[PDB]
């Protein structure tokens, strides 16, 4: 089966980090999601 590409937003934090925030299930991803292609 294929692995989908969900809602992967990039947010620039005051910590100076690029986090990802799964707008999928309203999940977060600090580093690159598994579904991140």
């Amino acid at each position: 089966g294929a692995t989908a590409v969900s809602e992967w937003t990039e947010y620039k934090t005051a910590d100076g980090k690029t986090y990802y925030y799964n707008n999928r299930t309203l999940e977060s991803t600090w580093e690159k999601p598994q579904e991140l292609k």
């Binding site: 947010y11 910590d15 925030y21 600090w30």
Partner: peptide, 8 residues
């Protein structure tokens, strides 16, 4: 569009 707060 407002940002979500970051997780710890």
């Amino acid at each position: 569009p407002t940002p979500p707060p970051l997780p710890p």
